[PDB]
């Protein structure tokens, strides 16, 4: 059964106006910001940017990848593709 999502989990991230995103859940560095209550915060693959984002915009990468993990047109997606499969929790700072 599910767990409670966990920094290194891979997903597909949704924000509005988006495809379906390859992204991870990042861990937050001590001294860094922290998400507000009830979000987690989300590393985009291929952009490398975050977004703090909750249960609802996340969907696991392994059940979704059929659906999402297909070649898109926007900056960064394909990528973002490379990343999720070939070295998801790589240093990309």
Known sequence: MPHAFK???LVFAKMKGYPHWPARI???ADGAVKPPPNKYP???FGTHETA???????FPYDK?????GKPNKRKGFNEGLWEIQNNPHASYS
């Open 52 to 58: 703090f984002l909750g249960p609802k915009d996340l």
């Open 42 to 44: 989300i590393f985009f």
């Open 7 to 9: 920094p290194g989990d």
């Open 64 to 68: 979704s990848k059929d659906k999402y």
């Open 26 to 28: 990042d861990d937050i």
